[PDB]
Structure formats: structure tokens, C-alpha cells
């Protein structure tokens, strides 16, 4: 009955936070490391403290959201249809229905077809306590739209748009994709993905700071 349209709102939050964080990780200017290096002299440590506090609130929201979805409705049957409806009433812009889709299907780590409360309960749990690895693995499936196990500079350029619209342009995708696409062929594999990010000081230092806060 009502719960449906309410579990939804809780679900929509989980996405918004999932982007915020992803962005925070540099997996998407809003990087925690960028934020850190924007500070100065006798402030660096004072900044590190602020960043930590605020990333701790975020942990907590996830914890609450987590324990929520969990012991409260861990079955499964979230329908991408009603979800897309909500995503548009808050994040309209253009083609909003497709973005929601792509952003929604991202919680489908086994490509089981759709998305279940379990997939959120898991996704949530990954950011909340998994390792950088598991986080990067989740982030990857976000870009691997079609879910073939690869990432095409276009799939990455779609997400990019899917976001600029969500918030408030296209060429950045190339330079970012070029970081991931090592063997320079037009496709990026999971291994390729996590190797570039792991050897990227910025995405690292950022993701490092976030999962130490507990
Ligand atoms: Ca792909
Ligand atoms: Ca490649």
C-alpha cells in the first residue's frame, strides 16, 4: 500500500547519497582530496578534521538507511517503473526516465534482471563497510550500463550526462576514459578499471579517508 511509495523515497535518497559519495571518491572538483588540497598552511589538519566529520555523518545516514532497508523489508521486488516516476518529480531535466533507469539498474550486480531490496541492502553495505575494491567493483557496474562486462566511452559519456542533469559537460568523459582505457582500444575491463583508480593518487587518498571514519 503506502509503504511502497515510501520505501521508494528512502530508495531515492540512497541513490542521491550514492552519487554524492561516488563523486566524493573521484569516481565521477567535488573530490574529498580536491577539497583537501584547496586548504592552506596551518589549516590542512583543520580541514582534514572537517572532511572527516562530514564524511562521518554520511556514514551514519548510510548506517541508518542500511539498518532500515535491512530489518524492515529485505525481500525484493523494487520496480524500476514507479522508481523512474519519483526520480523525475525531483530530478527532472531531460530524458530523466532513462537516467533513472541506468542509475537504478546499477544496483543489479549479478545482472539478475531487475533490482531487489537485497541489492540495495548489499550496495549500501558495500559503501558502509566493504573495501575500496568492492567499492570500485560497484562503481564499475554503474558505468557498465548494458552490463556486458566492459565500458564504452559512450556508456561513460551517458552517465556523465545522466548526472549533470540530475544536479544542475561531455568532453571530460574522453580524458577520464583515457585514464581507464589503458590498452587504448575503446573498452575498459574491471581489472583495467581498478588498476587505474588504484594507481591514481587522488581517487585513492579520497576513498582512503572515507573508509576509516567508522
Ligand atoms: Ca559496457
Ligand atoms: Ca581496454
Curated annotation (Swiss-Prot):
<feature type="domain" description="EF-hand 4">
    <location>
        <begin position="169"/>
        <end position="203"/>
    </location>
</feature>
<feature type="binding site">
    <location>
        <position position="144"/>
    </location>
    <ligand>
        <name>Ca(2+) 2</name>
    </ligand>
</feature>
<dbReference type="GO" id="GO:0005267">
    <property type="term" value="F:potassium channel activity"/>
</dbReference>
<keyword id="KW-0633">Potassium transport</keyword>
<keyword id="KW-0406">Ion transport</keyword>
<dbReference type="GO" id="GO:0005829">
    <property type="term" value="C:cytosol"/>
</dbReference>
<dbReference type="InterPro" id="IPR002048">
    <property type="entry name" value="EF_hand_dom"/>
</dbReference>
<feature type="binding site">
    <location>
        <position position="108"/>
    </location>
    <ligand>
        <name>Ca(2+) 1</name>
    </ligand>
</feature>
<keyword id="KW-0813">Transport</keyword>
<feature type="binding site">
    <location>
        <position position="110"/>
    </location>
    <ligand>
        <name>Ca(2+) 1</name>
    </ligand>
</feature>
<feature type="binding site">
    <location>
        <position position="148"/>
    </location>
    <ligand>
        <name>Ca(2+) 2</name>
    </ligand>
</feature>
<feature type="domain" description="EF-hand 2">
    <location>
        <begin position="95"/>
        <end position="130"/>
    </location>
</feature>
<dbReference type="Pfam" id="PF13499">
    <property type="entry name" value="EF-hand_7"/>
</dbReference>
<dbReference type="InterPro" id="IPR028846">
    <property type="entry name" value="Recoverin"/>
</dbReference>
<dbReference type="Pfam" id="PF13833">
    <property type="entry name" value="EF-hand_8"/>
</dbReference>
<keyword id="KW-0851">Voltage-gated channel</keyword>
<dbReference type="GO" id="GO:0005509">
    <property type="term" value="F:calcium ion binding"/>
</dbReference>
<feature type="binding site">
    <location>
        <position position="181"/>
    </location>
    <ligand>
        <name>Ca(2+) 3</name>
    </ligand>
</feature>
<keyword id="KW-0630">Potassium</keyword>
<feature type="binding site">
    <location>
        <position position="185"/>
    </location>
    <ligand>
        <name>Ca(2+) 3</name>
    </ligand>
</feature>
<keyword id="KW-0963">Cytoplasm</keyword>
<feature type="binding site">
    <location>
        <position position="192"/>
    </location>
    <ligand>
        <name>Ca(2+) 3</name>
    </ligand>
</feature>
<keyword id="KW-0106">Calcium</keyword>
<comment type="subunit">
    <text>Component of heteromultimeric potassium channels. Identified in potassium channel complexes containing KCND1, KCND2, KCND3, KCNIP1, KCNIP2, KCNIP3, KCNIP4, DPP6 and DPP10. Interacts with the C-terminus of PSEN2 and probably PSEN1. Interacts with KCND2 and KCND3.</text>
</comment>
<keyword id="KW-0407">Ion channel</keyword>
<dbReference type="GO" id="GO:0072659">
    <property type="term" value="P:protein localization to plasma membrane"/>
</dbReference>
<keyword id="KW-0597">Phosphoprotein</keyword>
<comment type="similarity">
    <text>Belongs to the recoverin family.</text>
</comment>
<keyword id="KW-0677">Repeat</keyword>
<keyword id="KW-0576">Peroxisome</keyword>
<dbReference type="GO" id="GO:0005777">
    <property type="term" value="C:peroxisome"/>
</dbReference>
<dbReference type="InterPro" id="IPR011992">
    <property type="entry name" value="EF-hand-dom_pair"/>
</dbReference>
<comment type="function">
    <text>Regulatory subunit of Kv4/D (Shal)-type voltage-gated rapidly inactivating A-type potassium channels, such as KCND2/Kv4.2 and KCND3/Kv4.3. Modulates channel expression at the cell membrane, gating characteristics, inactivation kinetics and rate of recovery from inactivation in a calcium-dependent and isoform-specific manner.</text>
</comment>
<feature type="region of interest" description="Interaction with KCND2">
    <location>
        <begin position="201"/>
        <end position="214"/>
    </location>
</feature>
<feature type="domain" description="EF-hand 3">
    <location>
        <begin position="131"/>
        <end position="166"/>
    </location>
</feature>
<feature type="binding site">
    <location>
        <position position="155"/>
    </location>
    <ligand>
        <name>Ca(2+) 2</name>
    </ligand>
</feature>
<feature type="binding site">
    <location>
        <position position="119"/>
    </location>
    <ligand>
        <name>Ca(2+) 1</name>
    </ligand>
</feature>
<feature type="binding site">
    <location>
        <position position="150"/>
    </location>
    <ligand>
        <name>Ca(2+) 2</name>
    </ligand>
</feature>
<dbReference type="GO" id="GO:0008076">
    <property type="term" value="C:voltage-gated potassium channel complex"/>
</dbReference>
<keyword id="KW-0472">Membrane</keyword>
<feature type="binding site">
    <location>
        <position position="183"/>
    </location>
    <ligand>
        <name>Ca(2+) 3</name>
    </ligand>
</feature>
<dbReference type="GO" id="GO:0015459">
    <property type="term" value="F:potassium channel regulator activity"/>
</dbReference>
Amino acid at each position: 500500500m503506502n509503504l511502497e511509495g515510501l520505501e521508494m523515497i528512502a530508495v531515492l535518497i540512497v541513490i542521491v547519497l550514492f552519487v554524492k559519495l561516488l563523486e566524493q571518491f573521484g569516481l565521477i572538483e567535488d573530490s574529498v582530496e580536491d577539497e583537501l588540497e584547496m586548504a592552506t598552511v596551518r589549516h590542512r589538519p583543520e580541514a582534514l578534521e572537517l572532511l572527516e566529520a562530514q564524511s562521518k555523518f554520511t556514514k551514519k545516514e548510510l548506517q541508518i538507511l542500511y539498518r532500515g532497508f535491512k530489518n524492515e523489508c529485505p525481500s525484493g521486488v523494487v520496480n524500476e517503473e514507479t522508481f523512474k516516476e519519483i526520480y523525475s518529480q525531483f530530478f527532472p531535466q531531460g530524458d530523466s526516465t532513462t537516467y533513472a533507469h541506468f542509475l537504478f539498474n546499477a544496483f543489479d550486480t549479478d545482472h539478475n534482471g531487475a533490482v531487489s531490496f537485497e541489492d540495495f541492502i548489499k550496495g549500501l553495505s558495500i559503501l558502509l563497510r566493504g573495501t575500496v575494491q568492492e567499492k570500485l567493483n560497484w562503481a564499475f557496474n554503474l558505468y557498465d550500463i548494458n552490463k556486458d562486462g566492459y565500458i564504452t566511452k559512450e556508456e561513460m559519456l551517458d552517465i556523465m550526462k545522466a548526472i549533470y542533469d540530475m544536479m544542475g559537460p561531455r568532453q571530460h568523459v574522453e580524458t577520464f576514459f583515457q585514464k581507464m582505457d589503458k590498452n587504448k582500444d575503446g573498452v575498459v575491463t574491471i581489472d583495467e578499471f581498478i588498476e587505474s583508480c588504484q594507481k591514481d593518487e587522488n581517487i585513492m587518498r579520497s576513498m582512503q579517508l572515507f573508509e576509516n571514519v567508522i
